[PDB]
Specification:
This is part of a larger assembly, with chains A and B.
Chain A lengths: L1 H5 L4 H35 L26
Chain B lengths: L20 H6 L1 H6 L5 H10 L9
Classes of the chains: A mainly alpha, B mainly alpha.
Chain lengths: 71, 57
């Protein structure tokens, strides 16, 4: 009884530690699988803000009266 | 694709200015003075809408 009193831990302490720790890592695993599914559909269709390789910037396209009428 | 539409030669015949290049270059400034008030309607038409077969009138 003295050994359990001065050194060891209650099963309540360890049990709730296990339960909280499973909650944490279940969040981690669900976010990881959701991450890779979001990544594969976002590479497939391209609608998302990740895989957008830079196209032409149209600010340099400056329409104006040219020399030749038929451009 | 959609084929093109072109006006026929029922409309594309105005009596041309059949003088050559020398006198037409020599008579330039007075051509800009008396006439060339209504040509800018033509030139504005041509520069706004980039389509001949439209501003031929």
């Amino acid at each position: 009884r003295w050994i359990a009193r001065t050194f060891f831990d209650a099963p309540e302490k360890n049990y709730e530690r296990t339960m909280a720790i499973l909650q944490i890592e279940s969040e981690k695993a669900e976010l990881r699988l959701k991450e890779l599914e979001v990544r594969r559909l976002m590479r497939a269709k391209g609608d998302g803000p990740w895989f957008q390789y830079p196209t032409i910037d149209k600010a340099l396209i400056d329409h104006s009266p040219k020399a030749t009428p038929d451009n | 694709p959609g084929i093109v539409e072109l006006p026929s030669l029922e409309d594309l015949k105005v009596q041309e200015v059949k003088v050559s290049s020398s006198v037409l270059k020599a008579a330039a400034h007075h051509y800009g003075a008396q006439c060339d008030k209504p040509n800018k309607e033509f030139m504005l038409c041509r520069w706004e809408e980039k389509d001949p077969r439209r501003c031929l009138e």
